[PDB]
Amino acid sequence: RILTTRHGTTTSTTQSSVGITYGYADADSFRPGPNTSGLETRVEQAERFFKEKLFDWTSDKPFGTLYVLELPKDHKGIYGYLTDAYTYMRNGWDVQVSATSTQFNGGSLLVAMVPELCSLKDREEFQLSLYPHQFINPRTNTTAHIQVPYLGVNRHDQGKRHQAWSLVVMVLTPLTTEAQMQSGTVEVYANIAPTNVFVAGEKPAKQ
Amino acid sequence: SGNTGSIINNYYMQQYQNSMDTQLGDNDWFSKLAQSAISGLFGALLA
Amino acid sequence: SGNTGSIINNYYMQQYQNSMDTQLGDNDWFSKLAQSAISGLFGALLA
Amino acid sequence: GIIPVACFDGYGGFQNTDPKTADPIYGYVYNPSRNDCHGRYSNLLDVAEACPTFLNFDGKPYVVTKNNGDKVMTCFDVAFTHKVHKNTFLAGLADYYAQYQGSLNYHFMYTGPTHHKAKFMVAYIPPGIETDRLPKTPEDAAHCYHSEWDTGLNSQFTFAVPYVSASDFSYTHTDTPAMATTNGWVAVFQVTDTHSAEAAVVVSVSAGPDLEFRFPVDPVRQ
Amino acid sequence: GIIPVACFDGYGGFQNTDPKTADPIYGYVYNPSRNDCHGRYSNLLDVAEACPTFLNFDGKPYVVTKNNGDKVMTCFDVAFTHKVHKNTFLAGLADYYAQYQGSLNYHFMYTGPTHHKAKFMVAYIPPGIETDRLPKTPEDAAHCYHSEWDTGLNSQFTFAVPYVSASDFSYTHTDTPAMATTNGWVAVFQVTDTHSAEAAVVVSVSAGPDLEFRFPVDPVRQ
Amino acid sequence: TTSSGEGADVVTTDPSTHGGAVTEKKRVHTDVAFVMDRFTHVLTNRTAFAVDLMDTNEKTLVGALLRAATYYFCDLEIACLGEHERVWWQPNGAPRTTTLRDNPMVFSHNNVTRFAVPYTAPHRLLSTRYNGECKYTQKLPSTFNFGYVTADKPVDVYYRMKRAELYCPRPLLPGYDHADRDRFDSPIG
Amino acid sequence: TTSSGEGADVVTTDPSTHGGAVTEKKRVHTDVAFVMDRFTHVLTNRTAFAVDLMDTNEKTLVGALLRAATYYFCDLEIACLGEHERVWWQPNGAPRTTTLRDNPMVFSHNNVTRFAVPYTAPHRLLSTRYNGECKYTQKLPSTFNFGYVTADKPVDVYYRMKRAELYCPRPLLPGYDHADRDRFDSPIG
């Protein structure tokens, strides 16, 4: 089940892939709108992988433990420059999550993308599968690969400020290590890249 | 369309009764998602 | 014409509802003026 | 010359569900184009089918595998008001609609270690007329419409629960006086009683292809 | 035999914007012919496009060229409520309409002596998310969507201000709580700082080809 | 886009000059025939009155846009409100009388009285302003009206311009004053 | 019907696996356009109010299903009740004023006032929830509304979604609590 995803010069092989999970649309497809008057310009270089640790995942953590990750997040790359140079901006995310572990470990993650969450009520977690999602079972895959189009009330999300997508990872079942190999902690990384970025309304350079 | 219906038709012009839509030129998902389902039994069915 | 509209039509005859117009026989300007505008860039455009 | 007409009593009162539309104020508004606005769903049962949601087993969706006998990991009603369904999207959708028919689907995803192995069976018990019971061993549940699966490379197992009832539709809400279920039980036996140790089976539910709600209602809660 | 009919509640109240027309009194009036009555305008945006009106720079439409540094002859919001637009026909027309979209046009007519020469640049600053700023030198404003012109035989220069915003339409009136503009600034730098002496640049504004107002409103003033 | 401005030639450049396309919009709410066609409030608690159309408040949409035009043509629709039995309407040029008979008349229905007044004034066009020897180095004549309504009891009155045709544009001004702040800043619901 | 669950592939098996046929049903009452189209009660004894559609009670059918969706599009129909002479309606983005004139207005007929409000908000879609820097490790902006109604006297209010289009599903929850008994058990007429 090998799968190799490249964006820009960056690549990401994975041999435990269970397949891409498209959310809400088979493919992101921008169309020009009245609101930018055609001044918008696509930028090739923004579309690259960048990665960040989410959490160590121990057996100590019970059901329903959450780890949200607001997107876009602050970043040192070109994408983090465009939030400073250009005001209005548009992108559709492509996200991997990886929780490498011995297959003798037992447990499961529910990684999912929630559009525009302000808060997530305690009762509400069971419903979380309505959102685009995949499961991380150590006995099977160690890699999830969600892919979503830009979503929002506005065709161009304001730079910074509003965050359309948030990457939530829930501990669907507690980790178990009956082999007692330790193991123990299982680090969970994410490997995220923008797709089909567009920018409009350049603003004066800092300072 | 929706919970509306009459043998006749609305007295006022469509321009007055409802906001007009505009194409992006000078869609449904969960139907397709539900139709993507594989009810076919996995493995070698027998008997 | 104007903010009026119905699938049907006005019950009374046009002679009763509105004053009839008369031709001077036994027009619009600012449309033309706005259409006279020259958006074409002046001088030798380059790049 | 005036057209005769006769206004009637009992007609023309305000109705919150009437087909007829209201008289317009503004005209010629043009809404912004919604082209390429992804994710629209035209019917709630579609999202009910494509998006399974987890059951409430004492606050935790999974059932733990156990060493002591018992063997009945769960034994819950096929009724939307039951506490197990309380977090599910279907119970929340059918909290409003008055009646239904058609099969449910239950997804069982094993989650334990790859070396750990287990065998399970689920059984659907038709409504009684049952003095209790319900059967507490797999040998007893074998007689019922059941299915049985062992863990392997393919973790998930989808058991479909048939709609068997005397009436073409059955109430979603449970009537206050009842000493027995009107839609029947379902139970999820483990079948070997030697498990060192723990393991877990995530459980979820989603509407079947043929399920159908009818009559919206807006009950006062509580 | 009488036709049944049901009068409804909530209908038939007096409405000041209703499509339906009133019952006639007189008939067969014949209005005098209006042939060869010149100057009719069928739409207000036409007169808004063909007839630019002057801006209010402290009571005087022109900006004076100046010797001391500064260089920012003007730096005003692209918003109709701004004091600069206060005398303009567009601010007075959009005082009524609730929303708009589309580009504005600003005309800059140099008025100084034929031997006097100058160079200017205008720049459009997108809405922020700006801690201020705004840039006070041309080198700083160069990064922004700008244009630059020097005086010559052809005096007038027409700079078009793009409609760049997240929403398809944007309010004409400014909401009471705001610490920053929602439609962005525009600024008109001189670019040499040696001008003996005076000179002046008349400024005016007129709606662009694609500008569009929507929703008439009649706000109570004050 | 340099061009001589002295000739007062029309110039309208789209952002295309900077590479941004802009499709033409077909505006409808800016249209005269659509905007002017509304029941503007004009006057309160008044019995007899001339149906002069300049009685409209100048801050209202219809009145302001009406004063944005020098000449105008309109069929009219009057709508009285408030308790009254009936409303008479004398066509333009009819002699004034304290009593009325046989002149066109409308009884109220649920304290509302709507009816359509045909354009009546002899002039081929009315005007919002009239230079009658009012020369200055720094009022409209009575013939400019649609009639003369009288009500049995004092009533609120509404006018609704129909088939409106405005001629020869005149300035619009915003009604609001900016006070100390150069940006007016107003509340929005 | 074993299948990998990690890929979150949709799976829907009918009882055919056990030899029982099940014909597809063509559900209509589950349909969005049909369900959302009703006069949900929203608020009582209130004069002026914004026509924010999130004022709907969350336990009502329309409000709950409305919160089951992240984005939505609706023409609207308002129906006021209770004694009042008239109801004004300011379109979205119009400045607030204590007095009102010439703004669209409807007199009551038998103490009921129904009228259709066109979708007005500039955004191509509204949303029931909006992540405006509300990050957390554990309110919607004013532009999201259909207008601003004011009544002459306080009135009950109803909203009726029209041409409803819900986007991006969100969780529904039952309102009832089971208390001591795991099965909720409720009375039926």
UniProtKB/TrEMBL annotation, chains F, G:
Highest taxon above the source species: Viruses
Region feature Disordered, mapped onto this chain: 1-21
Residues making up the signal peptide according to the UniProt record: none
Compartments where found: Host cytoplasm; Virion
Residue ranges constituting the Picornavirus capsid VP1 domain according to the UniProt record: 23-171
Function: Lies on the inner surface of the capsid shell. After binding to the host receptor, the capsid undergoes conformational changes. Capsid protein VP4 is released, capsid protein VP1 N-terminus is externalized, and together, they shape a pore in the host membrane through which the viral genome is translocated into the host cell cytoplasm. After genome has been released, the channel shrinks.
Full protein name: Genome polyprotein
